[PDB]
Design a protein around this ligand. Sequence first.
Ligand SMILES: CC(C)CN(C[C@@H](O)[C@H](Cc1ccccc1)NC(=O)O[C@H]1CO[C@H]2OCC[C@H]21)S(=O)(=O)c1ccc(N)cc1
Lengths: 99, 99
Amino acid sequence: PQITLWKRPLVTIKIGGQLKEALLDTGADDTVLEEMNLPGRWKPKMIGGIGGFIKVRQYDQILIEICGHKAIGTVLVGPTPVNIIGRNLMTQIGCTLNF
Amino acid sequence: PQITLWKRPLVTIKIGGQLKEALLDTGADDTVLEEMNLPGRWKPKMIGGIGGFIKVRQYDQILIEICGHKAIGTVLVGPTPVNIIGRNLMTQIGCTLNF
Ligand SMILES: CC(C)CN(C[C@@H](O)[C@H](Cc1ccccc1)NC(=O)O[C@H]1CO[C@H]2OCC[C@H]21)S(=O)(=O)c1ccc(N)cc1
């Protein structure tokens, strides 16, 4: 599909057996989701943006389905105010910017 | 152009007569540029990102060229970690997400 940017590009995702709404975010290197209880190993990470940094948990090789498109890769989890799909997974579903 | 997302979608912009590099950021409602001198009247504003809130100078109706495409809109100036082009200007240049 084609998503215009009049409004926030929020799409439905499926991860860890849950459906959520998340932002298709070309400005995010890596996906970061709001706090959730994922199983498995993780590593601490710090990610920075406007206002400074937050601490997150980095999970590797996590399956996410994004508007019916499957993807598997790094998913960070932490106190983000919004679920963010980053470039690391957007490349896997075929997402480009066009103008 | 069609821009893939295996690298950061950085583009050359022109604002106030000066060339800069900026990030096309579909997760940003607004355009936020690093500290710079800009002609025009401005108002003090606050904007929030992943790490908290920052003070910015809001310049209205600013001419800005993005990768050869002209826009006229709001530009926020402050201590952002990177020059980001938000949806307020990406809509003006006809930018969409496609997969
Ligand atoms: C500033 C960018 C280079 C990086 N950010 C992605 C960006 O899209 C965030 C994503 C975002 C979106 C909402 C809330 C927090 C973060 N947007 C943002 O800060 O936009 C602000 C300017 O316009 C306003 O609209 C939204 C917030 C304001 S980030 O959220 O900090 C980020 C950084 C690293 C990763 N791996 C993932 C996300």
